[PDB]
């Protein structure tokens, strides 16, 4: 198929353009770069064994969307593009609003201009807000996310809704995903953050790299076995796998189709030190700290819908999510090259 | 004070320029009359006493916005510009979520740019969705609004909550209006609804001045007194005076201030129609027909807080807002001139 993919060039967006790439679809990458370098394209078309279009735009602007759309003859949107630091939504709404907000609407204006009716969403289990019932199933109504950022997917999940009852024939996945984590196996390519890593895993990589002293872990006094922090993670290759599936089963099909993508497990702040200290041969420092605003005690996805209904389900363990991690960190320790 | 005033070409905006040049304020018109005429200017400017500046153009348009900000030393800013049509929201959520949302995002961030932080904006007692406590009073929760209209109010009282925190400095004025009707006491301004109107009072006044039939009476079943829907019913000139108020008191003022406008008691829509046959000497004609999508049986304002806070109340009656409405839609049938 022909498929957009913006911020393709970014963390999920590069495994699931190698994935896609494998499955022998025609990949158009559009990503502004304010998260992600030109020097993963390389590695997006080696490991995916084929080249992947790329063009430096921005979703915010709609003609230059619908040019694409058009010139491209696109069949099937992926819309990874965004802002998602939580920390900073709430220190800058405003860019966060417009780049997720006004972003997503620019495009599924510019597709509606192209005719384009087929769209895969980068949604999250924020939108749950504080659901005391867990796991959580698609079938729960949403509640209040407690940020910018994650408002701001609610919205879109809201207009996307709004837009398909309007338009029909649209197919749209809304994609919740639950705590990405991982790297390609070769190593070669993985998540890279530039400055402090907000999230566990990234933070825990660049403590054992040697990069930082210890792990600050948010919270020890948690209702959950170890007291820490209880999440569902998810290797990016199965969220990729995932990705390419829902694009493939679902094009043309009507429907506003929602799917929490994750393992169905929930694991420690601990249980990933722990796996991780593992992976990299050595004890990652850490300690306690005070609990993050805004996080809840535990919390998983109820991932049977999408096996039911898509046949997808996770294949790698938390042990992979870790290893690999710990082999790209340590295989490039720099990340991309400037 | 300089203040801006977006929609301020509509109906309730002209009104409000009206009494913001009666109190000598410099009035700052932008409108791109997609819902109004320039013929209203000088009818405006007449009944102000005062001549207030027009610029035509959109709130979509950061970069104008910033610039009139700018040249005009504006102090403040009450946005009334946006679409509002319930039922075309249905159909067409897109336009709506674009000139709401995106219209508010764009000004909001033109003023952040401009230096200008006092807002005041045009919100709708539809934020508080399927709120079975009546009447509504501000410290309630929000609800789901069931339209992409009511949605995008929401929405934006939303995003103007988050600047106010990231940007305390900031005074934001919530206005949460009612069911605002009625005319200029001169007859000679007014709501000029082009094509079929959607409220019930122009409605009403439609079937008077023998344009239409019957009035189509939306059930005859509700859980009401007189089986009818119940509303809160304001004059357009207290809300007008309500602003003006706000904007002068709230001025400087950091926070958040949300306000009901309304005139605090509910009226059937019997009661209405009853109030009209009064006002224009003959029976309105009216039939019931079938309930309508998404209407609620009976709500009305809480609006203690207001007077309390603001020391403003409501002056005009239900008569009055018939009249008034009668004298302009009999003074001037065909509505503002082309
Ligand atoms: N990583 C997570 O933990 C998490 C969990 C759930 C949801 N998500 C969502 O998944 C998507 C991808 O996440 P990620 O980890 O790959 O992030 P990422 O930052 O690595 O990828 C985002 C990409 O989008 C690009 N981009 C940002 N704004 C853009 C704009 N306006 N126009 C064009 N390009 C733009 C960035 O340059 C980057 O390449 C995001 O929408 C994110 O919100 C991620
Ligand atoms: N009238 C009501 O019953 C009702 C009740 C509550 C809330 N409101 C809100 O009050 C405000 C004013 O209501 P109204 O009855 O005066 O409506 P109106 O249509 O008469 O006024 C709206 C004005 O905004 C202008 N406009 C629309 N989109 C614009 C854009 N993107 N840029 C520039 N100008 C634009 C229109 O041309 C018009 O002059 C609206 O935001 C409405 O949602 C009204
Ligand atoms: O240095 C750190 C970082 C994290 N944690 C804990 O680790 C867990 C996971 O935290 P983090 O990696 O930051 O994940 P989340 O807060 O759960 O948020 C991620 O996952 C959500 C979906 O579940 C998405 O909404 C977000 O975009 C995404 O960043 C939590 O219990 C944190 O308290 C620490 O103790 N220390
Ligand atoms: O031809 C008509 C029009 C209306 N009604 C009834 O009259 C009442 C008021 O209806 P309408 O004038 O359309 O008002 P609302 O539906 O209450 O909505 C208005 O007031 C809300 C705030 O309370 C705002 O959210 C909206 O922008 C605004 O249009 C309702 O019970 C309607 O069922 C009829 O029976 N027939
Ligand atoms: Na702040
Ligand atoms: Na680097
Ligand atoms: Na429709
Ligand atoms: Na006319």
Known sequence: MRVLVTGGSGYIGSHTCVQLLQNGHDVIILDNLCNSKRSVLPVIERLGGKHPTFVEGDIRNEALMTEILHDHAIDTVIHFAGLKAVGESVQKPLEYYDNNVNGTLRLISAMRAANVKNFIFSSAATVYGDNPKIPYVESFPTGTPQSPYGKSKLMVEQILTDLQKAQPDWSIALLRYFNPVGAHPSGDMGEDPQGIPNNLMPYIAQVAVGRRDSLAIFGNDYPTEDGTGVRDYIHVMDLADGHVVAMEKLANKPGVHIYNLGAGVGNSVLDVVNAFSKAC????????????????????????????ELNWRVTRTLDEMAQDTWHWQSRHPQGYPD
């Open 281 to 308: 041969g050595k004890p990652v420092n850490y300690h306690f700290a005070p609990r993050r605003e805004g996080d809840l005690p535990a919390y998983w996805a109820d991932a049977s819908k999408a096996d039911r």
